Each structure stands twice: as structure tokens, then as C-alpha cells.
Design brief:
Chain C: Keywords: Ribonucleoprotein, Ribosomal protein, RNA-binding, rRNA-binding. This is part of a larger assembly, with chains A, B, C and D. In chain C, 26% of the residues lie in helices and 38% in strands. Chain C is an alpha+beta fold. The longest helix of chain C is centred in the middle third of the chain and has 11 residues. Chain D has 3 helices and no strands. The longest helix of chain D is centred in the C-terminal third of the chain and has 13 residues. The chains are: A mainly beta, B alpha+beta, C alpha+beta, D mainly alpha. Chain A binds 2 RNA strands through helix 1.
Chain lengths: 271, 37, 93, 46
RNA sequence: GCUCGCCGGAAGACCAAGGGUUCCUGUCCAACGUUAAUCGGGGCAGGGUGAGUCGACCCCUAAGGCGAGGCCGAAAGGCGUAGUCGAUGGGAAACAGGUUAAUAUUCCUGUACUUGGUGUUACUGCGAAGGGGGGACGGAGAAGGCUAUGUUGGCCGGGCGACGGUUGUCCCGGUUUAAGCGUGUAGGCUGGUUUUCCAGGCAAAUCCGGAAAAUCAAGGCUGAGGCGUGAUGACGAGGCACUACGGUGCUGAAGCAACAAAUGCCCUGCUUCCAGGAAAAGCCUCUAAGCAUCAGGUAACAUCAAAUCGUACCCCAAACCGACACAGGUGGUCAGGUAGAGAAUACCAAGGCGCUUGAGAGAACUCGGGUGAAGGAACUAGGCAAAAUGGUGCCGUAACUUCGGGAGAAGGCACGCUGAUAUGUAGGUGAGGUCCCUCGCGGAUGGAGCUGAAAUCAGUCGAAGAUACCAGCUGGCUGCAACUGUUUAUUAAAAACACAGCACUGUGCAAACACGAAAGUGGACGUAUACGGUGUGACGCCUGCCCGGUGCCGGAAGGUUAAU
RNA sequence: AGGACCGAACCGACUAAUGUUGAAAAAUUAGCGGAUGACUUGUGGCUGGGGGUGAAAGGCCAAUCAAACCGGGAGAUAGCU
């Protein structure tokens, strides 16, 4: 659900926060946590490689099983927990043998819902099974690229992948971007679509809500100087140039995909 | 006893403060030049 | 045990002071300069041996040498180790 | 007025100390030039 | 030595960093001290820094550094695995009194505590580089119980007082006592016990987890404080005795209660909200291989060991950083009385200082202030500066608006002291005594005693009762920017930058892009509700026409065209 | 609850005066803004010269910045003084 806060403060005027009482309020599961240190956008050379990254709240990583290779054992979802490293929400799920895992939660998945995997798993949301065993045209998320690699497609909140046709060796997927690409048959995938589709409905409200998420200010090109950016100077709001990246590459229209290795899989491109 | 005297000269031999004469002497030369255009 | 040569090159000289005299007569302890690298174990075994007394415990410290100038030339006196050795009821030296 | 040199011997040893100079070849050229010139306090260790 | 003055949330005290003998005593005034100098942080000599418990060393790791092999690179070299190092973090234990001119959790007195090695006695399963638990920990808010600590009364000791009174509801001082041990509380957490089974915890496991029952409704964990012991000990106002007249030996009464109360403890808790909140070792269990009448482990007693290094002194400053004995800068800890909401402010307590030139004169002029006739911005670029407002409660408060605000809008009334209500109110706190149980650090009761606002009525004094310090000037029209923020350290704080919001564009993951000859890394342990770039900059109404030029995207027919 | 309100520590620097061979190579004095957050601060580390970093001034990078400092080519060159 979304709630509009009363504008008792000027910073609280335009903030709409997504509330969800179904999420857990207690501490997360201890043996599935590990250290995830902040990078600040700086690589091993220490130089800033991706800018505007820094600050923010401290985050602890949660090992989410994107592989789902535990096959044939029924599992029951314990609770739904917040994951700071993903837009979606994760589900702490307990298997029949008594060992717990974190799975990426679809829409209807709540506490007490059964989860099965394998060729014997039923066609209901949350169940993971090879793509050749999936009916054509159903809602599918957490899609592998190569078999056994772990889920790589339609991971973030509100996402889904539609199966257009099955060749038997390859399966054509209409991705969330509107791209049609071929994916080999035996990659595993999860039914349904992920359960945080209202995540795009929130608005941060103030500058501090973007700062404590780890995002720094993003100074624009025409306020720069000629020695830093191709845009700059002009004795007051002069642009007179084609818009480019800070390193001179033309933006706003120029295509820059030069992969030439996965071009055989792309059936048709997004538009 | 007075080696510091030889060294305490060597302070404004590499100054940069263009608003002051020889780095330390404050003047009105800014205004004088500004108006002497 | 500690062999004889080491135990010997350890006690250098006794230290004389009015703090030493009050420590000698009232608390029954002796303060004497020892070797630079000497430890409390080698110091205690020596005073048991060469001084035939009933040593109890050893308190040690090192005084950093004072900086003095001779004429105009500056210099630093050699730092020495200080040691408080204490005994039970018996002493004649 | 906080000035530039606020001392700390932990930073002082870690930046220009002897083990820092010996760690790379360029500091080895520095230590050679201290010896070639013949400076008494050739390093900043003590 | 007697006064006067200044600080007293410091200009007091203790430290860390930093300094490196400035610390203490004796001795001298060459130079240093912006003056004299007998003095000194100056010169010379001597002395002074005592640790199983303080800190370092040591075990463990964060950011990161190095990096056997490995990969890559003209060379030098770069990245990086296993490892290794790296506190600002986690790990065992000491407190009270006394002593020096200078040392104190170090020395002495008294009372403690912890960890290993070894021996003996008694029992019997020990045993990892592995598994699990624990270490393990976000912000804000709210009390409750406490304590530090302060006030008052009682008690003890002392005094009848320079000038009216003062044997009294009078005046002054003290009324202190730790660690540790035992008790177990105010609280907070968790249902407990037993049995059976299991695709998991790489193998294994009695341990973790999971699934079935039976049985009981209670145990367990954590936990401030108080209490008794420690402690018929120390300290104690003072007195006695010698006085190197500085002090030094001897002796020593009362040593309680009530109230108030922390930012300190319970509390690493409780409640609540998203921005969802270190690692590893020590520690507790589980076994594996092996050991298996051993090796070991466990409980009691005894004994040994706890090394090495720093311990002075300054540390908001004359001793560190500022070339100076410099109006500056410098992180942490303690924090009393009165008034006061308060760590503000004013005066004070303990404590420390009067700032390394003084003595006169009482010109102009300059700096810092006080007052002022009459006018009240006429000065000036400009109310710059100065002046004025200031607190609490109550009444009352407009246009406009995103309904929150505006707004402390504006504008008024009361404020001291004394008595009565009420020989101090409401309230808080609360003993004796009574009753009842598990039978205690208990439950109901009961009001002694202590504390104590707020208001009304009545009277009084002054020119003035928020009388001192402290402590909003207000309103109307309007440009710009939505706003909180950030910026040219050192002439520009803004209409500049940022910002949430919006739009375009790129990118299907070995992504785009960026750093790198490369390896590799960030992006991101993220996956188109994501990430990058560009432009605009909340919100409301909207964002019209033009693709000829340039750029970008799509096209391949034809013309031109490289090496070959 | 609040990038809430008033106001100390703390952070900063809007106005004026003094100072400007200063007490000080940017301060003092009277006022002033923020003061639970995009806050502030101690300790250590990381990013380096046509490079870093920058809520963007061409600012900061050891009182030095439209290309730091030190040494070297170097006795650069100077139709100029």
C-alpha cells in the first residue's frame, strides 16, 4: 500500500512511502548474512569509475538462492523480509528436511505457502522448473541465461518474462524491456511475477532520501567548466553543442552495443 | 645565535598573494589599478 | 637456572640517595643500577647468590639519560636500568 | 588557525620511514642518495 | 602574611596525540625573559618515572597494504589466491587508607581477584584447519526503579561574640568508608520436561535444524540497586607531646534519617520507524581421523610462574601546531551552592590566577562605552551603525493557502512582598501500628514525618514587581529561488550549485560506461520498477509550429573509393 | 514523527568597528545562521600532476594551483632592459 504523509514539514510534503505490514519486523536469519562493504564507486586502482555513488546506510548482504537447484523437496515459506540490496522482497523458506533458504518472493507468496521444484512441481507461482516444462505464454521470472548459472533475468520488483514460442532447443522470451531473444531450453525459471510491483510508486520526498540510499549529487554538464566537461562556460547558460558524455561520446540517441557474441540470440531488438 | 635571521628572510621569496605587495604588505593597489583602466 | 657468567655481568653498582637511604632503613629494600638488558629473574638470582640474602621480589625501570652540553657541544648520557630489590629480615652489608 | 603540520609519528613512519623506503625501488634510490651525499640522519625513523 | 579583584561547564582537575627532562632540590645572573631580577619552563650539579590486575606487548580480525605459487606487462613492474600484517573495535583479573621535595590502582598497611605449568586425590571417554551457538552490536521516543550527588533535620565537637540584640525556632565544622564475598530484589527475555524419527548442517555427530507424540504448567536465562560481611579496621573535627618552627610523633566524639535527583546504571532493554542496522578470535557444545586398561578431560587441595616495554612533567597550553614565553588552532573524561527550564546567564564553593614594563599628567586627536534639551531619518548610495523589543500564563488574532500553516500574526491584562484560605493548599514521598500468606528485599492497610507548586481574597512599598545579567522589533507591496542544505580556506553565501520531481536517450549481463598497453576492478555480488549519460528543477495550468542546416537513428538500389 | 520550531556545546562566517611595519601571513569585539541531520568529529587508510577530487568556484591537492613540489636537460632561449 501507498500512503501520503501530511505536509507538517516542507520536506514531508511530497513523500509517498510504500508500507507493507506483511513484511517481517524482527531481525533477519543469522547464518544467511555476510559482509558487503561499501565501494564508493572506486575500483582497485582507487579512482572513481562510476560516479554519484557514496554514503548511505550500512547494508548487510543476504545470500539469495537464485539457482533453486534443491530439486523435488517441498518447502514452506516462513516469512517475508526486507532485502536492502534488491528492489524486491525476499522470502525465508523452510524445506521439508529442515534447512532454510532465502528465495525471491513472487506476488501471491505469503507465510504458509508451499514451494516445490523440479519436473514434479505443480504449475503455481513460486515453483521453479526447466523452461521446456513451462507452458507457453505464462508469467515467468528469475530466468537463467545458461543452465545451472542461477537466475539472472526479471529479478527486480514488478518484473516478468513472457514465453512467446518454444522451438524445443531454444525458447523465445519477450523480456521486460520489450526485447525478443532466444534462450536455450533447459534453463530453470520460476512461475509468476515478483511481488513488489508498487515499488515504482514511491517518491523520495527530499534530498536526504536519495542521499541515505547511497546516491550522491549529480552535477549537470552545462554548470561545469570546459576543462572538466565538454559542456561548460558561456557567460551564462550557453550550450551550443551536441549533448555528449563527460568523456566525449555522443549521448541522446547513439547506439553503443558492439557485443557481436550474443547477436545470434537476439531475435529482434527493443523499440 | 642569529642563523634564524638568515632564514627568516626566506619567507616571501616564493609568495603568490597578488592582493598584497611582496606577499605581506597590504595596500589599496587593487582599487588603484581597477580605476586606472 | 642461569649460568654464572651472565648472573655476574648483571649487577653493576649500588645507587646512593636519600630516597635510597629511606628505602634501605624503613622498607628494607635496596636500589642498585643493573645491566641494560637484565631481567627480574637474573637480577633476583644474583642477589641471592653474591649477596647471600633472602630476596623476595624485584622492581625494575630504566632511566633515560639526561641531555647535557659540554662547552658548546651537545650530548646525551648513557641510559641505565634501575632496580629495586627487597629482602626479608636479614642484612649486614 | 589549524596549520598544515599536525604531527603523528604513526603516519610519519608509515609514509617516509625506512621500511617504507625499502619497500620500493624508488625509495632505494632515495636511500642511496642519502648515503652518496652522506647525511647523518639519513632517514626520518628517529 | 593581611586585604582588593578575575575565572569557576574554567582562565579548575585528569588524560590521549604531541613534546622529550620542561619534574624536585641546591646553586649563578654571562646571554634568553620585549624593564629591573635575588626570580624562571634560563646556565651547572645532584636526585626523581618501581605494575600478574593501568596501557602497550600478545590472540583475533574491519577499511586497506604486502603477497609463495598464478595471470599480465619492452624492462622496471601491475593485479591477485592460499597466507601475512594492519585498531580507531572484541578478549583474564585491584580496591580503600598512608607515604616522598619529586612515584602511585606500581611503594607500604589491610582485604581481594584472574590465567597458565606441575604434583596429588576421585571419576571416566578424549579428540579438528570441520559443524552449530555465542561473540553480534541502526536511529528516535517514553517512562519506572535506582545511584552518584545535593538540601534539611537529628547527633557530636566548638562559640556567647569589637557597634543596638543574641542560651536561642542562635552561629561554625563534621556526620566518611571501596574492591571482593553471600543474599537475592525493581525489572526484561523465554513455556518447560521426556521420548521417537529425518533427502539438511560438504563426511560424521548425542550438538544445530526439521517432523511426530506424551506429560506438566512451572522452570530457566539475564538483571541495576539495597542489604550483611569486608570494617569492634581506616578516616575524623579537634586535643596531647616534641618542635630541624616548616611541621613532626601520640590520641581521637558523633559518624543517622528524610527529601530531591542526574545526560550515570538496569538499558547490547522496552516501544516505534525505515534508510533495515561489521568481521573474526577467545568462550560453549558436536563429532571425524586417530587415541583407546594410555593419551587426555573433569572436580578438590598443594605448589610455581604472570616475562618485556611506558609510568616524571605540560597537555585548550609559556612545554603540542602557529619562526616568538604569540589575543589563534587542538580529541576525550569529572562537573557542587543560590536564582534560573537549562551544560544559558549573574554571584559564588574546591581550585587557579591578577595576564614580564611601571610612575604621573588629566591637551588636541584616535579607540571602547554612558547620558542628553527640542526635532525624530531631515544624514546617507542605502535606517550602515546606534537606539528599541525580549520571560511565563491568559484573552485575542486578518488577507492568502498545498489546509500543515501564516502565527509568538498583530494587540492587551497580571507578575514584588506580607497574612488568610491552608498555624503551607492540591499533589508527591512515606514509617510506626494492624491484618494475611508462599512466610520475604512480600501483599492490603494506615497515616506520623518530609517535600510542595498553583490560584483567590486582603494589605503594604516604590517612579518602576519579566525591576540586575539573560532575553523576538513589527506590519504592508513586490522580483528571484520551491524549501533544509553546498560553494570561490584568505575581498563574492547569492538569483549561483545541489535537491526531490519530470522527460529523453543508452544498456539483455562477460551489459552500457569508466580505470587500466594487459591481467583485473568498479558498475554489482545489482538484472530494464535496474544502472549510466544529458537537460529541466517542488506543486497547479501547460509545454504550440518547423527535420531546410548540423547531429543521431534506420536503408540498401545506384555513383565514388583503401590495402590487396 | 519531522532534511520540524526557539536556543547552549559544536559547526560555520552575513554586517559593522578595530587591526592592517597587526596580538594574528584572515584575527578580535558586538551582533549572526544551522544546531537529530544532505549533521559534526577523533583514529587509520584510499585516490597524484594534464592526474586526483569537486552539492561546480577552474575551487582544493602541505600558508604554493588556468596544471603542485624537488632534482635534472639547463649556463633553455631572450631581435628586450
Amino acid at each position: 500500500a501507498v500512503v501520503k504523509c501530511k505536509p507538517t514539514s516542507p520536506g514531508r510534503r511530497h513523500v509517498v512511502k510504500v508500507v507493507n505490514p506483511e513484511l517481517h519486523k524482527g531481525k533477519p536469519f543469522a547464518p544467511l548474512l555476510e559482509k558487503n562493504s561499501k565501494s564508493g564507486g572506486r575500483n582497485n586502482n582507487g579512482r572513481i569509475t562510476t560516479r554519484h555513488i557514496g554514503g548511505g546506510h550500512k547494508q548487510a548482504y543476504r545470500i539469495v538462492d537464485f539457482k533453486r537447484n534443491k530439486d523435488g523437496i517441498p518447502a514452506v515459506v516462513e516469512r517475508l523480509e526486507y532485502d536492502p540490496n534488491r528492489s524486491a522482497n525476499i522470502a525465508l523458506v523452510l524445506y521439508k528436511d529442515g534447512e532454510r533458504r532465502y528465495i525471491l518472493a513472487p506476488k501471491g507468496l505469503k507465510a504458509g505457502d508451499q514451494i516445490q521444484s523440479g519436473v514434479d512441481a505443480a504449475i503455481k507461482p513460486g515453483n521453479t522448473l526447466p523452461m521446456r516444462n513451462i507452458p507457453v505464454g505464462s508469467t515467468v521470472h528469475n530466468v537463467e541465461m545458461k543452465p545451472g548459472k542461477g537466475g539472472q533475468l526479471a529479478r527486480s520488483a514488478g518484473t516478468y518474462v513472457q514465453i512467446v514460442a518454444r522451438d524445443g532447443a531454444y525458447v523465445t522470451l519477450r523480456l521486460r524491456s520489450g526485447e525478443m531473444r532466444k534462450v536455450e531450453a533447459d534453463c530453470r525459471a520460476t512461475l509468476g511475477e515478483v511481488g513488489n510491483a508498487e515499488h515504482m510508486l514511491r517518491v523520495l520526498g527530499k534530498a536526504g532520501a536519495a542521499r541515505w540510499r547511497g546516491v550522491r549529487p549529480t552535477v549537470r554538464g552545462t554548470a561545469m567548466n570546459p576543462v572538466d566537461h565538454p559542456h561548460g562556460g558561456g557567460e551564462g547558460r550557453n550550450f551550443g553543442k551536441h549533448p555528449v558524455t563527460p568523456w566525449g561520446v555522443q549521448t541522446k540517441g547513439k547506439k553503443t552495443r558492439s557485443n557481436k557474441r550474443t547477436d545470434k540470440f537476439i531475435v529482434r531488438r527493443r523499440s | 645565535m642569529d642563523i634564524n635571521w638568515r632564514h627568516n628572510q626566506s619567507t616571501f621569496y616564493h609568495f603568490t598573494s597578488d592582493h598584497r605587495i611582496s606577499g605581506w604588505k597590504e595596500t589599496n593597489a587593487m582599487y588603484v589599478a581597477l580605476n586606472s583602466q | 637456572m642461569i649460568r654464572e657468567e651472565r648472573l655476574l655481568k648483571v649487577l653493576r653498582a649500588p645507587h646512593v640517595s636519600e630516597k635510597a637511604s629511606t628505602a634501605m632503613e624503613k622498607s628494607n629494600t635496596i636500589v642498585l643500577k643493573v645491566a641494560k638488558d637484565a631481567t627480574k629473574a637474573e637480577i633476583k638470582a644474583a642477589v641471592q647468590k653474591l649477596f647471600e640474602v633472602e630476596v623476595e621480589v624485584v622492581n625494575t625501570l630504566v632511566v633515560k639519560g639526561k641531555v647535557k652540553r659540554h662547552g658548546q657541544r651537545i650530548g646525551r648520557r648513557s641510559d641505565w636500568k634501575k632496580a629495586y630489590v627487597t629482602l626479608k629480615e636479614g642484612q649486614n652489608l | 588557525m589549524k596549520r598544515t603540520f599536525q604531527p603523528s609519528v604513526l603516519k610519519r613512519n608509515r609514509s617516509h620511514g625506512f621500511r617504507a623506503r625499502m619497500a620500493t625501488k624508488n625509495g632505494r634510490q632515495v636511500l642511496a642518495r642519502r648515503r652518496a651525499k652522506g647525511r647523518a640522519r639519513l632517514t626520518v625513523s628517529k
